[PDB]
């Protein structure tokens, strides 16, 4: 149904939504470099559970 | 005639071209569609769920966790008879005040 044209005039609508899902990616990538004191602060440091290896992602 | 210019255009009335005009733009079909966007993506998805989202937001500022700790802490303190909350905060016994 006209798809050759609804795509051309409404392909802009996907830009921002992928931008958001992209924005989460760098958000969930930059934190990895910020690991450092992962389960290290004595306020929150505790015994590591049998299966999971990382307390906070 | 000073300069070869144009007379000031007259403000067209969107209503007299189409009586149902919503004032969003000239062309009727997009104007009706702009209505749907401004309301559906205005009042509907932002005001309704956004209010519920912020209203049902999880514990903010620990407003209730502190209460529960205070109840337990105050219940501990007057049970032993010592004052229910000390005038001092950082225990002076450790403090090594100069002279």
């Amino acid at each position: 149904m006209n798809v050759l044209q609804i795509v051309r005039d409404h392909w802009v609508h996907i830009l921002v939504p992928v931008g958001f899902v992209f924005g989460c990616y760098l958000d969930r990538r930059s934190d990895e470099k910020l690991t450092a004191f992962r389960n290290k602060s004595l306020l929150f440091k505790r015994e590591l559970r049998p299966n999971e290896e990382v307390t906070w992602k | 005639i000073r300069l070869q210019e144009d007379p000031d255009p007259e403000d067209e009335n969107l209503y007299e071209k189409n009586p149902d005009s919503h004032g969003y733009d000239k062309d009727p079909i997009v104007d009706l569609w702009n209505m749907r966007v401004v309301f559906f993506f205005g009042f509907s998805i932002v005001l309704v769920l956004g209010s519920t989202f912020v209203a049902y937001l999880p514990d903010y500022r620990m407003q209730e966790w502190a209460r529960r700790e205070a109840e337990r802490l105050v219940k501990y303190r007057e049970a032993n008879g010592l004052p229910l909350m000390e005038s001092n905060c950082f225990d002076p016994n450790k403090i090594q005040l100069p002279e």
Partner: protein, 459 residues
Amino acid sequence: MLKIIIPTTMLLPMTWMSKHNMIWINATVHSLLISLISLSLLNQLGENSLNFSLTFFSDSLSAPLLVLTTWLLPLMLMASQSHLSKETTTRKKLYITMLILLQLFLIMTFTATELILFYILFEATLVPTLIIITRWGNQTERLNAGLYFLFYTLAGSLPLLVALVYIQNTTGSLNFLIIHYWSHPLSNSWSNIFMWLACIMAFMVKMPLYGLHLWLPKAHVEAPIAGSMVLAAVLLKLGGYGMMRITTILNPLTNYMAYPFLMLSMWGMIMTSSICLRQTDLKSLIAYSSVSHMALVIVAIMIQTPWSFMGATALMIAHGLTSSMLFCLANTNYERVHSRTMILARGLQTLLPLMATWWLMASLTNLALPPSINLIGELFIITASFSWSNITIILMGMNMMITALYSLYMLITTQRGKYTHHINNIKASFTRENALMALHILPLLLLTLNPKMILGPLY
């Protein structure tokens, strides 16, 4: 963090590459969508600010302003698609480009973790607004108006630049957390006052206090509708955000040096509100009202009291939403009458009955009528100020008394009274203007139920 920024900047290619007539639609869609995502950021923890990385972080103060700016973004698009319809598609796209580029900077500065990073886009907001005021402004004196607005802020901002880099060379980093934890008692040495003056005057200028405020009436009146809202609803408030952030290393020097500003602000609000009582221009009257409310925050922030900060953040937002609405009121009336004089179009309520209502809660909200967020702001500030000194309530309450007279003065002169005979072009209000007006008032009363969201980190 990023989940707001890339969606904002990736919005820019959309408007440029969208269809010829769909620009307003798709921009409005995702601007509201961005608002929803920003509202997801509104959550805050107990005491530690929501920290994201070295480059960005948010606290209980930044978050309410962030959601306000994103919330604003649809409103200019809604408010502007009437006087820009007869314009070439490129200029319309350029106009939209200016707004979101402006709005993008606002997210950046409010979330900035480093004072210099906060500083770089602190003036960078000026460039898009300068274009908006100058190019699309609809007046003659807008040219001198843009010059006044531009030079005033720069004249105050540049001392901050020299001051800020001095902090870097003396106290290492200028990360907001590292300043707060390593704060040291600023001495009374005669250099430290000029230290104090430079770190403060920059935020003074774009928070119009009596004397340093003549740009605002020239800024607001000649600016177009979208320029007026963004300038009055967020731009006057970067100065506010700076003071809550930068006063960490200005104590106890703030205790003694606060006096000239406090007297200037407290007396200024009586003077400025008096100007409102006899303003011939509706837009100017609203503009001067912003000075009075903003000058109240000057006393609020500069007292440096837990309660004072809280009421500041309450007036921080409530005034911005209200001032944007009143500018919408003036704009929605202006093009119908094609003039700015208040007495030009009297008795509008008999002609437009719904706008009579919209003007009515708008005036009531600016009245600080309880329990509107404005009342929570002013009433909290009065108590904090009264604890600081008993006399100030004489000045404080007098402002509310003056604020009553001029607020309903526009109501009676415009809405009530006899309709003007000669005018005959007043058409029934487009439901766009009506929809936009509710877009402003409805969240305001919605905020009344949850002040704690906008009370701030002091809460």
